[PDB]
Amino acid sequence: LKDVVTREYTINLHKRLHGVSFKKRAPRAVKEIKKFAKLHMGTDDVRLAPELNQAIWKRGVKGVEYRLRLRISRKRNEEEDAKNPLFSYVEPVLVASAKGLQTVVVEED
Amino acid sequence: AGMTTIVRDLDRPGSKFHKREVVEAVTVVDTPPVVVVGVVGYVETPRGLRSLTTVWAEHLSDEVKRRFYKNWYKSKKKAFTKYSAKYAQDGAGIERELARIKKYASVVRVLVHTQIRKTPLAQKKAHLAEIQLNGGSISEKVDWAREHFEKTVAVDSVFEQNEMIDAIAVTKGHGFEGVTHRWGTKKLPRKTHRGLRKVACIGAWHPAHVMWSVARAGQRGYHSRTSINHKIYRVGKGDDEANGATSFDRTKKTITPMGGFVHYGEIKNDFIMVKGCIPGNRKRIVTLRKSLYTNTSRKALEEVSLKWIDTASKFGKGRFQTPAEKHAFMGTLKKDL
RNA sequence: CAAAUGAGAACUUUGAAGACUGAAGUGGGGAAAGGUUCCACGUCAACAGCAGUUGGACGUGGGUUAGUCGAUCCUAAGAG
RNA sequence: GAACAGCCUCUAGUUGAUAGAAUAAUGUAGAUAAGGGAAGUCGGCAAAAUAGAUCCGUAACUUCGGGAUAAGGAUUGGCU
RNA sequence: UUGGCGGAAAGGCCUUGGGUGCUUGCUGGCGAAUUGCAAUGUCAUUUUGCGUGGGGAUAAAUCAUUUGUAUACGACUUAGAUGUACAACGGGGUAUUGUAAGCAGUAGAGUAGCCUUGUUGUUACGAUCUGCUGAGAUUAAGCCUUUGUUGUCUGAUUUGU
């Protein structure tokens, strides 16, 4: 019963979206978070929470936050599962600031 | 590695800056000692120089076999394995090849390779080249090569200060370029239909072809260039703190600027500071070659003593040479309690 | 962004966010014109210069209620 | 705000225009530029500069009505 | 089997010796027809194979990922199966800006009174000023370590001397 890990990460959307056209910054932030989850858990099937979408779009197209504290939980697919048995769910985690935070495993307990 | 600035007294008897200090741009080339792994002999033929054989070293560096590979990580690392099996005897197939190089091969060159692991680059793939030995008989040259097998030659052995050398490098690439910047053609007037960064007339009616001498768009940069007459301003030692320290400054500081050379890093190895610019960009392999003639010019024969070397940050407008000087100017700070 | 529907969803629906028109509007009605395009119910053949589960498309149906709103009556330039 | 001008927002409506990736040249649209300032060019074409309001000041000429916002100067916020 | 010599494109030359076969150097014995009167009348060569034997070692490239010293796309410098390797975050260095929020001040032009009979009693405020505070924020996206945390490391195609 492995590959069910949940980890807290900090993603630097600043370096991610440096030099991007203003009308594509929040969509590109969504795609960069998908790629970040894929690089850190190997799962193509990345599902973003609507609250994380709200965090990304909090300040319009070009107002994506500099650093985002995400909670990526790799889970197991079900209900007519897709090609990949595993998928990642990316959630927003509320912090006062996203600075000074290191990636940390969280457990179901 | 990058460019920096020096201050030196200028000595040409007759200039209005004679015995007056001058501020000069210099280029720093980080030169860790290169390993001599192998030699090749060239017999002269009525079709040019033709290599007759190459004799390699017994143990080759991991970086040099990486040079020989492409997907190095997913490899059996079988490279020069049977050559080293040929080795481990006295001269079973080795003394014979060296003897062939002596008997023939008027021109003999040593195969040398860089220490990319010493250089701050992330390459791990050494640069393998040939260097021609230019003295003595062929027997002397091949004896030199065989004696220097698996040995590291430092640049202070070959290049001296106040010396004119040539830099051979591939210049910085700039992709596809228009004719206006690729050739420096006059821009067309503002009221030009269909663009103005072009050459207006690319040929007459006859000959009914575009000639090779007409300027056209295409690749700019990434060209091989050999620029001559660069004066070596310093041959500094990596195993030496206060590299950038001179008899005028006497401050214990290294040539590496504040925050490190931009896009490159540090110069923890031996280095050369040459005057002016050289072809190629930072992080790029360059070849430093001895002059092909005897240049006096009353400029090649100039004795250069450096009075000061700029080690301020190149990542902006750095006002300080050393962290101690920065702390001395700014006093105590909030971060350091 | 998620969910639903669906064989199939960048485009359908529903939530959530970000926006826009900014009251001489991208809003609510009408005149000429169109003629059923209105509205409900079913899916890929065509059409919607990508797609389509959607549609002003396709098939089948339903829909327009006046003594008071208009016409009808009057005369205008004019026609006869 | 002088203002159904330009900007932002309630009501209402829309989120429709094939998309994804990358960011070569040349384009289209929009900008900036040392020092010089029309030397460019048929030609100051194009662009720039000017600009609202208050106060001061305002010539030649004149059909006495104008020219005139002539030209030319200064000020402008917040708070008590 | 023994010396070599030959690098211009050497790929050729004798020998030192042992074994074997012909010898037209000089003389004999047998055979040849009939392919019919000629018919080129068939005699020498960049490759291989279910195959046989005198013997040998079990490699890479490419796609996918990455990289940015490159780049329109291809190409091009790079990295990636346990390394002081790579990557995502965090301190440092570095740099850019200019002194953050909050709290406090008998600071601040001033506007309205108390009575316990006027050298700090105080309130409803008040742009700004001062202190914490060269602070705070940003810092590679084409500047470094994972001495800190956390993860990654056997996926697909082709190559005949």
Beta bridge partners of B231: B164
Angle formed at CA B139 by CA B135 and CA B140, multiple of 5 degrees: 40
CA atoms within 13 A on the CB side of A65: 20
Helix (H, G, I), strand (E, B) or coil at A54: helix
- Compute the half-sphere exposure of residue B46: CA atoms within 13 Å on the CB side of its CA: 0
Residue A69's identity, in one-letter code, is R
Which tokens in the block code for residue B154? 């430092």
Phi-psi region of B301 (alpha: psi -120 to 50; beta: other; left: phi over 0): alpha
Alpha carbon distance B168, B82 (integer Å): 35
Question: Straight-line distance from CA A71 to C1' D79, in Å?
Answer: 49
Judge whether B53 and B43 are in contact, CB under 8 Å: no
Alpha-helix runs per DSSP H in B215-310? none
Please, are residues A90 and A52 in contact by the beta-carbon 8 Å criterion? yes
Spanning CA of B193 to C1' of C10, the rounded length in angstroms is 39
Other Cβ atoms less than 10 A from the Cβ of B307: the count is 14
Protein CA at A4 to nucleotide C1' at C17, angstroms: 29
Torsion sign over Cα B213, B215, B217, B222: positive
Number of H helices, E strands in chain B: 6, 14
Nearest one of B120, B115, B153 to B2, comparing CA atoms? B120
DSSP H or E segment with residue A15: helix A13-16
Question: DSSP letter at B262?
Answer: T
A34: nt with nearest C1' to CA: C1
Chain C: nucleotides under 7 Å from a protein CB?
Answer: 1-3, 15-19
Say how far residue B38 (Cα) sits from the centre of its chain: 21
> E strands, chain A, where?
6-12, 46-48, 67-76, 86-92, 104-106
Q: Which amino acid, residue B314?
A: K
B155: closest CA among B292, B27, B34? B34
- Strand C within 7 A of A49 CB: yes
Nucleotides of E under 7 A from a protein CB: 7-9, 58-63, 66, 69-72, 77-81, 86-96, 132-144, 148-154
Q: How many other C-beta atoms are found inside a 10 Å radius of the C-beta of residue A90?
A: 23
Is-contact B9 B259, C-beta < 8 A? Answer: no
From the CA of A16 to the C1' of E33: give the distance in Å. Answer: 104
SS3 B130: strand
